[PDB]
Amino acid sequence: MMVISEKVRKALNDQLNREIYSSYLYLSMATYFDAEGFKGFAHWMKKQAQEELTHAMKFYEYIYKRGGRVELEAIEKPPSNWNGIKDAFEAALKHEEFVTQSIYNILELASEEKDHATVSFLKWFVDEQVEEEDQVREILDLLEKANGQMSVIFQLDRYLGQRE
Amino acid sequence: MMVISEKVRKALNDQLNREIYSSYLYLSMATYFDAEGFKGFAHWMKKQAQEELTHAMKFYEYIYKRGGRVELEAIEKPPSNWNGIKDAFEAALKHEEFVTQSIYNILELASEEKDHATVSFLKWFVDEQVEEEDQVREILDLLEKANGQMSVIFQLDRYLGQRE
Amino acid sequence: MMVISEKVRKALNDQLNREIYSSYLYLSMATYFDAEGFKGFAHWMKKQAQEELTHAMKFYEYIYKRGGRVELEAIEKPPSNWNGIKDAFEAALKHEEFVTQSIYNILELASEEKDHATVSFLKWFVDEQVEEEDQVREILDLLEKANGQMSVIFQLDRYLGQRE
Amino acid sequence: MMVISEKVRKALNDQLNREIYSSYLYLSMATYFDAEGFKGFAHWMKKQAQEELTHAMKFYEYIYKRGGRVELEAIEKPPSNWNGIKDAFEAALKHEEFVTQSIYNILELASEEKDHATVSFLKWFVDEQVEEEDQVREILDLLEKANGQMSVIFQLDRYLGQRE
Amino acid sequence: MMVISEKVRKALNDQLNREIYSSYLYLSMATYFDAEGFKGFAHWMKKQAQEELTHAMKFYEYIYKRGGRVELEAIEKPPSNWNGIKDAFEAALKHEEFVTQSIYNILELASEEKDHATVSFLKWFVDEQVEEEDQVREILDLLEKANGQMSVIFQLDRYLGQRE
Amino acid sequence: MMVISEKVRKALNDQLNREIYSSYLYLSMATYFDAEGFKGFAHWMKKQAQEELTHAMKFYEYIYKRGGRVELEAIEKPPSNWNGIKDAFEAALKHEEFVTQSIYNILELASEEKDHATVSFLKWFVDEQVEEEDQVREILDLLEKANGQMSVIFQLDRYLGQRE
């Protein structure tokens, strides 16, 4: 029997599908970077897409551990184009902050229901979101300091393509 | 400049999106098996989902090698339930046969345009599809021999749960 | 369900039985060389017989992978005698070319029916036939220069007796 | 010079061709098991086919050691179908006992001619047939206890698929 | 005896000489880059000249395997100068695309004659040409982003100078 | 600034193209040996062809080290046919002696101009030419002792096929 409420279960299932879209969105940024010839930036986004799937699977396993079930929903078409290298990463940061707020909303719902298990489970994502936002802010800061010089952009592309 | 025709490029980009859905469909079959308590079958479907992602990324790589660009499209909601273990694998089998026919159509399109590079590239998927269909047929054959006998179904769940 | 046509399955099953006969034929050439006291040439033919069996088993595996069945047929009695070492290899070259043409006919039949899986599967045998015909031609050209000189035939016997 | 009588050489050459058919017969039993979806039992028959070929090559080497030569004959078409797993292995047992009696006849013929070299050479096959018959009797005994229970047949198939 | 047609042998022999000229052409671009003081770009072209030689030897090997012989023809004088780094690599891309079409013509010729051995042999060059064109397009894209900036050109020179 | 005179650079550039032809000539001798079925002699000529390319690149390096630039010229069609194995190697010897005399002429030209750097650089080729002429003379002496006997020629083919 399910020991999370249907409201909490649906909130968690909604976030799983949101994590799937985040994966799809980052792959779409890879299609943009590859079209612009930045295979290092595209590589960074492909690795980011795979990491987002592990976030989705962590929601997946917790839902079943609490006696629930996952229902996959349609994935909306992501944007394919951005007005430059820095514009894409600014869209990534805005998305991650949106995901952080979505995690907050589940946390507050679970907290009002005294669902301490789900509240505690979400702590990992709260801390992880802090790191996800910082990693994009650092990249954005280096892109701003580059100020469009292919000199620096070439090294940052080579550097981000180095991601394991 | 793109050296594949827009017709061939659209056919390849469509197949990439079909591979993305195939991954999603097998993830949804994993949600079904996990809901039914068969963590070995669910594990098998999760591994199949990741293998379909590598199929999509192969189309991804080739499109850019020929000067094209990938555009990710919306992903339809897959079915979430099946009328049994054998009904799911039968849906998996006919999905894969449909995928083989879709690859066949690109090959014939590429062949009529004398796009030998794409014809040769598609050979790996033709051979791979032979194995994809065969492994599902083997599971269906073992499930039919099982005839819904839990002691045998337990062994196949453990067996498929060992997939690397 | 069989996903190859009955016409193609019979063509593939016929070639399996042809590969079995070729295996048998090379063993019979070994019986001739051993009768003549050339254990190096006989060793080469015994290894060639084993190699043809792996060709037959490759057809075996593909037929079942496509949902078909193998039916073994009677094997004709091969010749037991040849008019010397060079006459045997002249029969071997003529035989390999016959096998190559038999592979060609299956390839063209599968191609007419748009059976791309079988067309792709046969590519391995096409390339292998290039090597097998070349190996016999190399031996025949070296035998032609030998002109029956026993000092050269011994070293070639010792050399071919070293086959892995 | 040949130091075995032509009567003995013919008996040994006939047995060689019998071993070739034995290999072919067990390969045909593999085609039946593979058609029925028991790839473990089919694996057992494919390995058994290889072992019969080593029996043929043992007769091969001895015939030439005694100054004789081998003449390969046509191979009869083996049966392609059996009415069940127990029917196939029971046909295997009766074939092996028929092979044992044929070896007995050579031993008695050779001993009446006081061909002690051939009598002693056949000792290895006499002992080997004891093991060949016993291994089939053991499988038949396990099949009789299984009485068609798929849970038992499944891992008996897996066990015989482990044959080295 | 030659088992490829004279029409196909000449087509293959013509392509071998084409590969020889391409080898010579890339060596000539190295003389240009070295004259301009770019030892990294020159190093890249010297490695490319050697890779083209292995292409020629592959055609060499196959022609003799099919019973033909190679006849070396005169090599035209390649251009010695170019209007810039990007002019050379754009001439390299145009040449490689011309080489691919020459491979396409041989494949279509061989297929019209049902020379399946040559059609299958040429698949390797079809796939290789995809990579040859892709790597030059990548360099052209990096040169376009450099836009003549010596700070960026210095990085691309050292990068291409690291080619093994 | 170029520190060799234009007359010395032209003499060096002419020898570079001469070395390129020497490589091409030995590859042509390989096509003849392969056409005659002597894969050992052909292997020797293929290795010799690769060695001549390193001679050309040595001239390539020295010309640029002295501030000059290389201009590649057209390569004449080499001969494809010889009367026999001993003609090919006798043509190789007289070609190498011609190369030695051409190096002598550059040496005397450079010494007339008191270009001590080029004179000392050429010493390596003077000593190397002694070895190249010697190794061909040894092969010619063994072929003369063979006197067209195929049993001895086969041993020399195998031996020269071992060249590293």
Ligand SMILES: CCCCCCCCCCCCCCCCCCCC
């Ligand atoms: C090497 C580059 C890899 C890029 C991967 C991009 C993945 C995008 C996925 C979008 C959503 C489609 C459904 C994915 C299901 C994944 C299931 C994983 C189970 C372990």
Ligand SMILES: CCCCCCCCCCCCCCCCCCCC
């Ligand atoms: C050196 C031995 C050559 C033997 C040639 C025999 C020709 C006729 C053989 C008929 C039966 C062949 C059975 C082959 C079974 C192979 C099983 C392989 C399993 C991986």
Ligand SMILES: CCCCCCCCCCCCCCCCCCCC
């Ligand atoms: C490192 C620079 C190399 C430049 C090569 C330019 C070649 C131009 C044509 C001259 C003839 C080349 C013959 C090559 C024969 C190679 C044989 C290899 C056998 C494995």
Ligand SMILES: [Fe+3]
């Ligand atoms: Fe996330």
Ligand SMILES: [Fe+3]
């Ligand atoms: Fe797929």
Ligand SMILES: [Fe+3]
């Ligand atoms: Fe064959």
Ligand SMILES: [Fe+3]
């Ligand atoms: Fe036996």
Ligand SMILES: [Fe+3]
């Ligand atoms: Fe090439």
Ligand SMILES: [Fe+3]
């Ligand atoms: Fe030289």
